[PDB]
Write a protein that binds this ligand. Structure first.
Ligand code: HDD
Ligand code: HDD
Lengths: 727, 727
């Protein structure tokens, strides 16, 4: 009709803007100048809308899209209304099966580039030159929950990267923990059925806190290592930008000379490692179930591109048997103290999709999608994964032509003798649909392996043994890796692990399952088992107290790279601060606050007891982003309260609770001038306490002190003090 | 190996048990004696498990379900492992498309029976005899969220009932509010796309609180009536057992004489009407996203069978045009003050399904599934619905044989000349697959319409008009029903409506959309418009302040049946109380508490600071249901704190917070003996306060008081005292 506002405020500016400043929008409209080879190749299918007539799918203009065709304006709808039927038909068949696992995920486009050529250890074209840019499409996910489930659950996270290389698609399909729960792919359905919602009633969603999961874990000790990781704060990342990524399996790099090197893939978050705390994470699934999806999208819209460093743990073929654990066992990590991660390149995620369904929901990643220069190993979990990811998209994406769905298409050439199949897009002109043929002079043709642009040939690994359904005896060790993880965590991390297990086991209705898990914990570490047992009202038996702890892992009694926080790696850029306003804010405090934050790339959200505007002491009109209840402290990293008319919000329950919640969840709090009246709400001594910034004004070192606290992420020293606190 | 506990505690007793007393289980194992014709008919496909060998789907016994077949124990997985491939293949294809709308839902089996024969107004067989029982299967749902989204969101709820009658399946596919948002089915995709997650980033899940929903609403005033209902506490029901159900459209009843009577269908909850409050509902989506699903399942396991009374609003054909609204407009309700709801029969849900996927997920309901004695009308929304529910299951349920999926099968005879289609189960022996035929003597044959067991014949409604895509002028009135609804709500219901709109519109990023919605509210009621505007920091113009309110609906200035709470309808059976234990509970208090609760069918959950057990003062061992943090006050209807060693929990942060949350959410709280010292936490009253029960001990009087409070659901008089509380 011409419904947009005449001031053009319905449309977000096509420039980087901080979270909440503008309505979010499709990537190609928000950042039209951000391009890459894959984004450019999608232009043949992108469809605009502005200034076009509304039509049917057959191109017929529609005159009246408000009404069905009927006999009389109060009459029956007629079967001849083809416009109505096409429209309802398309609607009626919008949904496709969600992914069996990792159904909940958020994605973005980006690019990768190696730091140096890796030609000495791999012939993979995408790693051959520092000036070779490879477009990527990354999808981060949870594991258990459906596509409509919440983001901040306690779960493993998926981290899948599609590399659109010149020699084929390479999908690095990893998780955020360096091991998996099980050893052989044959048990995948068992483990997944145990963690997913129980079959009689389909409860619970997005949670391993239920009987069948802990029943399985209790009977399958190989799971304990990844369970330790999920029970730690690793299971509740602050954002996809602040978690590590791992390929888990040992793969092979193959160079031009034919040498095979064992490799484990790593992704290091350039924003650092950071996680929530359980109470915050759980409440946040309620206050904002889309928190991670939203945060990823807004980071990219703000120019805070998620950046990751690809790294390789490399192990020579001659060292295959030199560790206490098997290199092919996916339940075992390779300690970085033994084999360092060598930095390989950087990945930058800089553009959101246009249409979530078309690009994210239909994206298909599969770890079998490798390119010359890479190869597999006999890891029995990886081996079975290779079967699943091609199979599953026959139903998920309707057939074998899923590589023709725009997001999945290679940007490099693809030609073969495969034909037909549902939804076939490619119209083949080859006279032949078979090889060998003479009628097209045998094109397209096979290509011999070679240093560059050659055909794929598997590494000639020696195979020797009988046909058996047998677990290698080298895989039968289940407690040393769990113990190594435990011992590498800080004391507050251990506490959170103890709390994770305790909370989850408390949701297990059958008490014997809790007892059985406690017995397993006693094989890992007595302190851990005792603390969990104590929280479950369970007493360890004398036998349990005397279980000998598992051996160190190759002499290591800890590896600090396993902790999120043991070694500081703080990065404040992209974090956000809640600013609690009053109706006569000291504008000077606000100016100092906002400019300090902006200088470090830290965002702010101005909150009040209503929407609209408030006027500062000097007449400055302050736009309100949200109310105290509307954007809870769960969604920010720190809270600042400027001086002004504090009596306005002093007796506001929501404003007081805002600080209590943020205080309980160990976030930095800064009070200027009369805002110090709120110290009594969080019980802060006159003298002050580490973790609370306070001064007569927001000047001098007030902002630097708060930013130092944000750099450390959370105020771990406050844990004992939050123990009480009714919040 | 891995086997059941010696003591048999892995398996739930097969008898009615209170929530939490036993692990939940498949219905046929929990209540094997609960039968009905439909449940029995599902016995052909029910599959046991105990004492049977594990096999492939082809019936081959599996020796080792722990490993893939490989060449050597550390070798490559072989392609000949068909056991692994079948198992992984079935896993890979588990998911089916979720429903386009109402994907989130919970179901149960039950039975219905009319109070008396309705043969004078309808020939429908299921309403013909008070002693003839009809098996039902009911699915309750939300609308917007995916199948993995949360239960206690703010949304409309679906209430679909499949009646397995002797003359065909009758599906009564309704919602929990008496009107829908839109008038013509052609706009269904528009409305649903606006409320669903926005297309660029697929946010937000299970929420209408986003720009596109309010944009659509602001441009389509026909939506305002159902929006009023959604924003009231109707949008966040306490349970599926405590909400009304409505068919929305005017349908027809056809008797044996051929007389048509207009009818609107109602379901009255025999447990009464009850809703949560927003803060509670929203937090509960995070603490227990499966709350309604769980609550329904547990109610049925406990014997608190959800019971509903079917009721009809009947309007003679000659009264079609006598209201000031069109009877065929689904955005208009029929005030009970004008046309009373006649009681028709009772529906009882007494058995949970066995497998959620097979029975709930694959259930197909469709409002076109009617039987002789019922008929449609020209309601333009209902008309388009008839097209869509058959159409959508061709993708959702994989084909046209969805009536052969066990839960969907009619229990009466079904014979026709339709053949084939994907996964055809029925093997037809008829020599003929067409009619007329002589080769099978024309069987199965058509049946003339008649008083009973007759063929379906449409009511011969007179149709007169030109072929038009036009809305009836009579549907062009959008503010009087919204205003009637507003004026019928109690003062606290009005405030919660105000808060609903305010909260939602505060999440609309484009400010002009908020203003346009406020403008629409000014057309309904200025008090309402002004209260919302104040919260958004918006000022009504002088023009807006002078908008004439819409006319009363046929002289009505209010209709108390539109309110949840104006007319007392409380029922405590099935409700649940949290009991905060201490390590030396005064058993005399507990005895009295449990006895009084038990006499009214109210359940209890014993909570503590840890799991396991605590021993009362008389040696009674009390098993702990959950921790204070583990089963928040959100999940209960009231909180009781018995005396004993109060020092044990007096300083516990979670225990204190438990009471503050319950207090803020207007729930009855009862404190006996030294537990009255908790009154300081909820900072209020010394002489007592209506809503807080206190006494030296828990006695008959104390429990009567608490139970009387529970019968009124929430303590609305405490509203003014809760916005200072920091919780
Ligand atoms: C044999 C089965 C199997 C096993 C053993 C694995 N999974 Fe897998 N996973 C699948 C079968 C599968 C799947 C059914 O094929 C999925 C679901 C739908 C899809 O396209 O792929 C998939 C999805 C999937 C995704 C989502 C890709 C997306 O965003 O689309 C990730 C990140 C992982 N998996 C990661 C892993 C890791 C790191 C594993 C252990 C090392 C693992 N999976 C074990
Ligand atoms: C023209 C399309 C159309 C319109 C105008 C309506 N819906 Fe509908 N509804 C559908 C198209 C549909 C559907 C696409 O066909 C669905 C999802 C898939 C399914 O089986 O049915 C459905 C599902 C569906 C369900 C879930 C049944 C279940 O539990 O499986 C309920 C309760 C409603 N609808 C009720 C309503 C009511 C009371 C409506 C308004 C008066 C309404 N729908 C308007």
């Amino acid at each position: 009709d011409s419904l947009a506002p005449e001031d053009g405020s319905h449309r977000p500016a096509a420039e980087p803007t901080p979270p909440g400043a503008q309505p979010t929008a499709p990537g190609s409209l928000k950042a039209p100048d951000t391009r890459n080879e894959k984004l450019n190749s999608l232009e043949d299918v992108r469809k605009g809308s502005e200034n076009y007539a509304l039509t049917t799918n057959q191109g017929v203009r529609i005159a009246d899209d408000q009404n069905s065709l009927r006999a009389g304006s109060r009459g029956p709808t007629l079967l001849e209304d083809f416009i109505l039927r096409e429209k309802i038909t398309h609607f009626d068949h919008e949904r496709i099966p969600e992914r069996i696992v990792h159904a909940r995920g958020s994605a973005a486009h980006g690019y990768f580039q190696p730091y140096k050529s890796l030609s000495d250890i791999t012939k993979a074209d995408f790693l051959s030159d520092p000036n070779k840019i490879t477009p990527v499409f990354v999808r981060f996910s949870t594991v258990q929950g459906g596509a409509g489930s919440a983001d901040t659950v306690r779960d493993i996270r998926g981290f899948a990267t599609k590399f659109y290389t010149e020699e084929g698609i390479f999908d690095l399909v990893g998780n955020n923990t360096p091991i998996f729960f099980i050893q052989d792919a044959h048990k995948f359905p068992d483990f997944v059925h145990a963690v997913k919602p129980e079959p009689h009633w389909a409860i619970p969603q997005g949670q391993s806190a239920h009987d069948t999961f802990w029943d399985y874990v209790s009977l399958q000790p190989e799971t304990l290592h990844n369970v330790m990781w999920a029970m730690s704060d690793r299971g509740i990342p602050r954002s996809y930008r602040t978690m590590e990524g791992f390929g888990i399996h040992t793969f092979r790099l193959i160079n031009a000379e034919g040498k095979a090197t064992f490799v484990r893939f790593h992704w290091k978050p350039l924003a650092g490692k950071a996680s929530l705390v359980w109470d915050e994470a759980q409440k946040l699934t309620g206050r904002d179930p889309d928190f991670h999806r939203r945060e990823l999208w807004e980071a990219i819209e703000a120019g805070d591109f998620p950046e990751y460093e690809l790294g390789f743990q490399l192990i020579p073929e001659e060292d295959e048997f030199k560790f206490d654990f098997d290199l092919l066992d996916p339940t075992k990590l390779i300690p970085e103290e033994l084999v360092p991660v060598q930095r390989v390149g950087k990945m930058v995620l800089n553009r959101n999709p246009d249409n979530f369904f078309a690009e994210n929901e239909q994206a298909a990643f599969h770890p079998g999608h490798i390119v010359p220069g890479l190869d597999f190993t006999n890891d029995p979990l990886l081996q079975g994964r290779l079967f699943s990811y091609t199979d599953t998209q026959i139903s998920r994406l309707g057939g074998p032509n899923f590589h023709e769905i725009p997001i999945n298409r290679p940007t490099c050439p693809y030609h073969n003798f495969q034909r037909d199949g549902m939804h076939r897009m490619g119209i083949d002109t080859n006279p032949a649909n078979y090889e060998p043929n003479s009628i097209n002079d045998n094109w397209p043709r096979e290509t011999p392996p070679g240093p560059k642009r050659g055909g794929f040939e598997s590494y000639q690994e020696r195979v020797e043994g009988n046909k058996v359904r047998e677990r290698s005896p080298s895989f039968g060790e289940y407690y040393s890796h769990p113990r190594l993880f435990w011992l590498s965590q800080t004391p507050f991390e251990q506490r959170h692990i103890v709390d994770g297990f305790s909370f989850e086991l408390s949701k297990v209705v059958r008490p014997y399952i809790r007892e059985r898990v406690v017995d397993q914990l006693a094989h890992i570490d007595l302190t851990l088992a005792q603390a969990v047992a104590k929280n479950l009202g369970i007493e360890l038996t004398d036998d349990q107290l005397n279980i000998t702890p598992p051996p160190d892992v190759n002499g290591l009694k800890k590896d600090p790279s396993l902790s999120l926080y043991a070694i500081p790696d703080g990065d404040v850029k992209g974090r956000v601060v809640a600013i609690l306003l009053n109706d006569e804010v000291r504008s000077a405090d606000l100016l100092a606050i906002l400019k300090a934050l902006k200088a470090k790339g830290v965002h702010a959200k101005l909150l009040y007891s209503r929407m609209g505007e408030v006027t500062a002491d000097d007449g400055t009109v302050l736009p309100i982003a949200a109310t105290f209840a509307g954007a809870p402290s769960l969604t920010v990293d720190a809270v600042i309260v400027p001086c002004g008319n504090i009596a306005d919000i002093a007796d506001n329950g929501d404003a007081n609770y805002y600080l209590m919640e943020a205080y309980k969840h160990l976030k930095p709090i800064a009070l200027a001038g009369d805002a110090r009246k709120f110290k009594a709400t969080i019980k802060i001594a006159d003298q002050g306490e580490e973790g609370i910034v306070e001064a007569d004004s927001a000047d001098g070192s007030f902002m630097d002190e708060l930013l130092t606290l944000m750099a450390a992420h959370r105020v771990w020293s406050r844990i004992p003090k939050i123990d009480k606190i009714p919040a």
